Design an enzyme around this catalytic site. Structure first.
Site, PDB file in Angstrom:
ATOM      1  N   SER A 144       0.863  -1.203   0.000  1.00  0.00           N
ATOM      2  CA  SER A 144       0.000   0.000   0.000  1.00  0.00           C
ATOM      3  C   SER A 144       0.899   1.253   0.000  1.00  0.00           C
ATOM      4  O   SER A 144       1.728   1.423  -0.936  1.00  0.00           O
ATOM      5  CB  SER A 144      -1.010  -0.033   1.162  1.00  0.00           C
ATOM      6  OG  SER A 144      -2.081   0.905   0.990  1.00  0.00           O
ATOM      7  N   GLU A 235      -8.915  -3.402  -7.490  1.00  0.00           N
ATOM      8  CA  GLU A 235      -8.615  -2.366  -6.527  1.00  0.00           C
ATOM      9  C   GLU A 235      -8.520  -0.999  -7.155  1.00  0.00           C
ATOM     10  O   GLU A 235      -8.274  -0.859  -8.346  1.00  0.00           O
ATOM     11  CB  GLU A 235      -7.418  -2.714  -5.633  1.00  0.00           C
ATOM     12  CG  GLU A 235      -6.121  -3.025  -6.314  1.00  0.00           C
ATOM     13  CD  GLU A 235      -4.955  -3.128  -5.329  1.00  0.00           C
ATOM     14  OE1 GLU A 235      -4.759  -2.177  -4.525  1.00  0.00           O
ATOM     15  OE2 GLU A 235      -4.231  -4.160  -5.363  1.00  0.00           O
ATOM     16  N   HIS A 265      -6.800  -5.032  -2.666  1.00  0.00           N
ATOM     17  CA  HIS A 265      -5.690  -4.352  -2.039  1.00  0.00           C
ATOM     18  C   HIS A 265      -4.976  -5.257  -1.045  1.00  0.00           C
ATOM     19  O   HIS A 265      -5.583  -5.751  -0.082  1.00  0.00           O
ATOM     20  CB  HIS A 265      -6.227  -3.122  -1.324  1.00  0.00           C
ATOM     21  CG  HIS A 265      -5.177  -2.119  -0.968  1.00  0.00           C
ATOM     22  ND1 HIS A 265      -4.321  -1.568  -1.906  1.00  0.00           N
ATOM     23  CD2 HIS A 265      -4.869  -1.539   0.220  1.00  0.00           C
ATOM     24  CE1 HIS A 265      -3.542  -0.683  -1.311  1.00  0.00           C
ATOM     25  NE2 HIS A 265      -3.836  -0.662  -0.019  1.00  0.00           N
TER      26      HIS A 265
END
Length: 294
Positions: A144, A235, A265
């Protein structure tokens, strides 16, 4: 069609989910991430170290080759996450890669904004080198926001004369603080995960959102080591990844993009209950190993 486990999990993720737009205080997103975290596997051993003034842990799964190491940078939008939130998944990366992970507790925003996190990563990297790990025995991975940082740290370490490690694995990287890519509109109704805009706001604290070290999709990547990029098809941050792969290959970097169908994700993180989870971790590890044998 699509694996059942992801369908189940998507269903659960949409239930547990806070409805769009509602304003969750920071110290409530923080504590909630801590409470839902998976416990690492019982065979994962852990040792508290301090590194560049940050708390860290070495996270050694069974089978670690002496002399190899992974600098690992956890997700959480630059505002949250911790050693604790990532110990599990990172434990498994260690397993798949036969390498100890250095799991850094870098400085978080808004208490410590950009470039604090990059400063911490670059320094985490220096520290490893000073401990005698050979750049060709090192790897950098993160998820991320952590995936962005991975890139940010590479670019910044390079600019500073540090040697590039052997490989780099951004997982679902967030590499564009501007948050303007198609995939926010296109892939929205498929990602169960202005909340992300808030994080950019907290992280940047007034800074240029197209800063190389904040949004590495705008940086010069020339000379980075080979990249595996994982991302899910379903995502919001798909484009970040695609544009990262194109950017890398344009700058001469050996990039391998894998978009995984039906996935979300950092699906890796849900390895306990999601076979694609374990699968993609195993691949992360295979690739770190592939890169070390060349």
């Amino acid at each position: 069609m699509a694996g059942p486990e992801i369908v189940k999990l998507k269903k659960i993720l949409r239930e547990k989910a806070v409805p769009p737009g509602t304003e969750v205080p920071l110290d409530v997103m923080r504590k909630g991430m801590e409470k839902v975290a998976f416990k690492a596997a019982d065979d994962i051993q852990v040792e508290q170290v301090t590194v560049a003034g940050c708390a860290a842990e070495w996270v050694r799964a069974p089978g670690c080759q002496a002399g190899k190491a992974i600098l690992y940078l956890h997700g959480g939008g630059y505002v949250m996450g911790s050693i604790n939130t990532h110990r599990s998944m990172v434990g498994e990366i260690s397993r798949a890669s036969q390498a100890a992970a250095l799991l850094l507790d870098y400085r978080l925003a808004p208490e410590h904004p950009f470039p604090a996190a990059v400063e911490d990563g670059v320094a985490a990297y220096r520290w490893l080198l000073d401990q005698g790990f050979k750049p060709q025995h090192l790897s950098i991975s993160g998820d991320s926001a952590g995936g962005g940082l991975v890139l940010a740290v590479l670019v910044s370490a390079r600019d500073q004369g540090l040697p590039m490690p052997a490989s780099a694995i951004p997982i679902s990287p967030w590499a564009d603080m501007t948050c303007t890519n198609d995939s926010f509109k296109t892939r929205a109704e498929a990602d169960p995960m202005g909340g992300i805009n808030k994080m950019a706001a907290r992280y940047l604290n007034g800074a240029d959102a197209k800063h190389p070290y904040a949004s590495p999709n705008f940086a010069n990547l020339k000379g980075l080591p080979p990249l595996l990029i994982h991302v899910g098809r379903d995502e919001v941050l798909l484009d970040d990844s695609i544009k990262l792969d194109a950017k890398a290959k344009a700058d001469g970097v050996k990039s391998t993009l894998e978009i995984w169908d039906d996935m979300i994700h950092v699906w890796h993180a849900f390895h306990p209950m999601l076979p694609e989870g374990k699968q993609a971790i195993v691949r992360v590890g295979e690739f770190m190993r592939e890169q070390w044998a060349a």
